[PDB]
């Protein structure tokens with residue numbers, strides 16, 4: 001295959017690790033440079049789920065579907081109202097288990113990580129600078145020895161600072177905002193809400209305030225509250241100390257049932273983040289010194305309320321990965337050129353749904 005050279009993937013998230021695996025399956029030489037300190041760093045967030053057709057195809061090809069099923073956990077979902085009434089409830093039906101079981105972000109990385117040869121990932125590696133060499137890239141790492149690569153694959157999230165050689169387009173705030181926390185022993189610390197989820201993911205929407213929870217992410221309750229960014233914050237409240245956040249949440253939620261409030265009372269620390277999108281507007285630099293591309297969130301960061309992200313990114317993995325091994329191209333530049341073409345197709349389409357959908361809710365109504 002077209003790589004008797006060496007690849008550098010920047011980013012050990014689910015998309016970056018899948019790349020690594022798909023390449024290394026074909027005897028390609030890959031290293032993943034991850035900035036997490038070690039294998040064991042906690043990944044904050046909800047649970048991923050892999051769709052048939054996309055995410056799961058990624059896993060089928062990596063020879064990892066069964067392992068994914070093993071560790072994943074199917075979940076019904078309830079729609080509830082501001083009051084605690086279950087409006088709807090779709091349960092796991094035996095036949096449709098495998099459609100999209102939820103997996104914990106750390107568990108998934110354990111699966112991927114386990115599938116790579118030793119020392120494929122190089123930990124404690126924060127990429128800060130890239131530089132086109134004679135015939136290969138030079139990667140700069142904060143207070144760590146530099147490295148070289150014939151191909152660089154950016155897979156380092158939606159805030160990647162090293163996007164320039166591919167495009168001058170930059171991420172943008174979408175208009176909405178997300179607060180989220182985890183509650184441990186949710187069954188005694190927030191029994192009302194925990195009992196309300198009754199073993200299913202829970203969602204409720206009220207006057208443009210979204211509450212979404214999963215009662216069982218490896219035994220913790222994860223939840224997030226989303227909303228249109230308050231007119232004032234121009235980019236002012238502080239997620240450092242919680243009394244600030246609690247007053248704010250408890251305000252826009254005073255309307256809501258005591259059970260949800262108890263959710264905002266027990267949570268010890270909150271993390272705030274503005275929804276962003278890396279818009280697939282114009283084409284990317286046709287003029288590139290050395291081979292380089294982007295997959296997953298680096299390529300098309302988009303709002304999550306649709307259910308998008310990662311599947312779309314794992315598809316990137318799949319598609320690029322094949323292009324560079326099916327020998328159906330006479331050069332690397334061609335193969336990446338082609339992948340970037342296909343992904344612009346379904347990328348724009350996804351980003352279209354999620355954006356529009358984001359506008360749907362966060363209005364004065366919704367019904368999922």
Ligand SMILES: Cc1cc2nc3c(=O)[nH]c(=O)nc-3n(CC(O)[C@H](O)[C@H](O)COP(=O)(O)OP(=O)(O)OC[C@H]3O[C@@H](n4cnc5c(N)ncnc54)[C@H](O)[C@@H]3O)c2cc1C
Nearest residue numbers: 011012013014015016035126127156157296297304309310
């Ligand atoms: C609030 C919220 C809820 C979401 N819910 C869902 C959901 O329910 N389902 C779903 O499918 N998606 C969801 N998403 C989307 C989602 O999870 C992303 O698409 C997914 O994380 C993308 O994977 P990735 O590998 O491309 O990027 P990342 O997961 O962000 O991986 C990037 C990796 O690169 C590393 N990194 C960053 N900078 C550097 C650097 N300079 N050098 C080296 N490494 C670096 C990071 O440590 C990280 O490990 C949600 C997103 C948000 C914000």
